[PDB]
């Protein structure tokens, strides 16, 4: 009823503000120019790295809590970006914006999916939310440019912060240790996208003159993704087989021997047996814990692999020296997906919209002139091109 | 069996060569430079305009016939583009490639969908075909550049023509007055994309300095699309009710029915009534014929509207003068879709992949440097951004 419409409005505004914050910086780029590529892609990289952790956190705790802290982070980071003047401060504010926007978007989409039960209504709500997400990137630049050129210099950022604050207030009123681990995760995700070397002294002449070297250096990520997509399946099959192999003995005067080898919840189960439903419940209750632990392990392993590869990239003097790191990165981005797809399905849509809007805006701003070459965003774009049309 | 695998291989190769032909020209652009945006986007514009007509033609006649003429057109136009040296000849060859590739791709995808009956197998085949379609754009530039800078000047075009010929031969051997209307349809689609004034004398300065003018000029196509999406539904609902009302009076005793009967095929049907199944069959078949005629009419009307708008575009003297033509174009592109989606569903996937690959390649080539602003491709991109994530 009224609550469903309120939730839909809140989620729509959250996604719209997310993409507006992503794209609004395009008309201001020449003014700063009087390095740019990394400053532009930092938010997208951070969000694309940190989405699955927020998904798992919302699965564990719940939906309403992450949205408020996401709104607060977005507000604080937007204000800091508005009032900052130094390159490092701008980059830090951009990364904070990325984390906050990712958390808010994922949690809001999850709650909106949870509220609607009927299939067709759920599809309509998803369509409206994704439409707002997609049209934010187009409404960004004109709104930003008109406010920038009529009134003030930092007006668009303050207006967006005010909108964020108003939406948070509407969510709060009208609607009716682990901490160190979360801090470490946030800091690692910031650090991965904050620092990136490129060796532009000889790399520029390399890509401009000959592109076949670029292709042979950058395509093996596609093979690595396919190789790494199977890890969760393999491990889950092994874990499922292991428990049933043990329980086969219990499956089989001998009953007293079975009770003896059983020998305190398991003891109580063995006593109350002397059935099939009990062992079914036992398997189900252990299986979920195994799944959750394995998902956490694979997410951490993927983050570690990406960090190690980005730390190992700069120590190369040839194009072929770039073959080894790429094979790493495309692996990790695969593995994480293998654990997240069965439970949540809108991560593909969010990543696709973000990447495609970023490419659209970059093409527009590049055409506008008449800036640096991002490394991880190229891999993300290649993977998206190859495997998002196939998935749909 | 062998037949299904052979069809899958043929369709995969056809789609791969389609996209490779689309993208391979990128590394050659700077060499030719030492005007170009239209030359790059002509093929995409022509294909996106001419897809639905080929879809209807294949629905009417059959799948095998269009593929062979598409292969022949692709071969001839690729050779002509290879051996040409003048701007007009290059543009004409590009448009011919566009028509041939569109026909081959649509017909092959249709036949591949037709062969597979099982749902999961059909999904797998569609996934493989779209994977080839999507990887063509990445395999294009490296292959083209390496062939260009190792051997010869026109080697990649000849190699692609040879591959086209080999695939056509495999299709022909191993596998076991409307004409003037089709000619006019082809010529009009060529002419729409061949000529575009775009008025670049002062549009660039008022587009780069201020972006809100660009937004207010280009966004209303999104509203026009939503308005025009309902045309087929409204017309079909009106048409069905008119036929139903006439027969409902006679639907209802027997004496009155005979009395009305007192006043060749229709006579035979009326005699054999003296039942319900005959009425059902009559209604279904006449409705089907009416729907087919209405689809043809709306496709022609959309083409006419687009042509009139592109002829009326150059007259405008101010930015606001571009508001009226856009409201036209976004209408037609909507209306055609309203008639094509219920029967065929891969048109959205084909258009999305083509547009997104084109934007990716344009961004790459623009980034590599260090002119030309397409008009209709911008509208297509806006519509795709806004309404493809929602549709998926």
Numbering used by the authors:
A (entry chain B), B (entry chain A): 16 to 49, 133 to 274, 296 to 371, 384 to 394, 423 to 433, 453 to 548, 563 to 584
Please share text taken word for word from the publication where this structure appeared.
Vesicular monoamine transporter 2 (VMAT2) is responsible for H+-dependent uptake of monoamine neurotransmitters, e.g. dopamine (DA) and serotonin (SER), from the cytoplasm to presynaptic vesicles in monoaminergic neurons. Vesicular monoamine transporter 2 (VMAT2) belongs to the major facilitator superfamily (MFS), and mediates cytoplasmic monoamine packaging into presynaptic vesicles. Substrates bind to MFS transporters between N-domain and C-domain, and are transported by a rocker-switch alternating access mechanism. In this work, we report two cryo-EM structures of VMAT2, with VMAT2 from Xenopus laevis adopting a canonical MFS fold and an engineered VMAT2 from Ovis aries adopting a non-canonical fold.
In the end, OaVMAT2 with the TM8/9 loop replaced by BRIL (OaVMAT2TM8/9-BRIL) or AmpC (OaVMAT2TM8/9-AmpC) yielded stable proteins with reasonable gel-filtration profiles. Subsequent cryo-EM single-particle analysis revealed OaVMAT2TM8/9-BRIL structure at 3.2 Å resolution. Interestingly, the OaVMAT2TM8/9-BRIL structure is organized as a homodimer, which was also confirmed by chemical crosslinking using glutaraldehyde. Surprisingly, OaVMAT2TM8/9-BRIL C-domain is folded in a unique way that is distinct from canonical MFS C-domains, which usually have TM11 and TM12 arranged near TM7. However, in OaVMAT2TM8/9-BRIL C-domain, TM11 and TM12 are positioned away from TM7, but close to TM8 and TM10. Interestingly, OaVMAT2TM8/9-BRIL retains binding capability to both dopamine (Kd = 0.68 ± 0.23 μM) and serotonin (Kd = 0.33 ± 0.10 μM). Notably, the basic amine group of dopamine/serotonin interacts with the acidic side group of D402 (TM10) via a salt bridge and the main-chain carbonyl oxygen of I398 (TM10) via a hydrogen bond. Meanwhile, the VMAT2 inhibitor reserpine bound to OaVMAT2WT with a high affinity (Kd = 16.0 ± 5.7 nM), but did not bind to OaVMAT2TM8/9-BRIL. Interestingly, crosslinked OaVMAT2TM8/9-AmpC also showed a minor dimer band, while the rest of the protein appeared as a monomer band (and a high-molecular-weight aggregate band). This data suggests that the oligomeric state of wild-type OaVMAT2WT is different from that of OaVMAT2TM8/9-BRIL (and maybe also OaVMAT2TM8/9-AmpC), and the dimer form of OaVMAT2TM8/9-BRIL may be an artifact induced by its non-canonical fold and engineering.
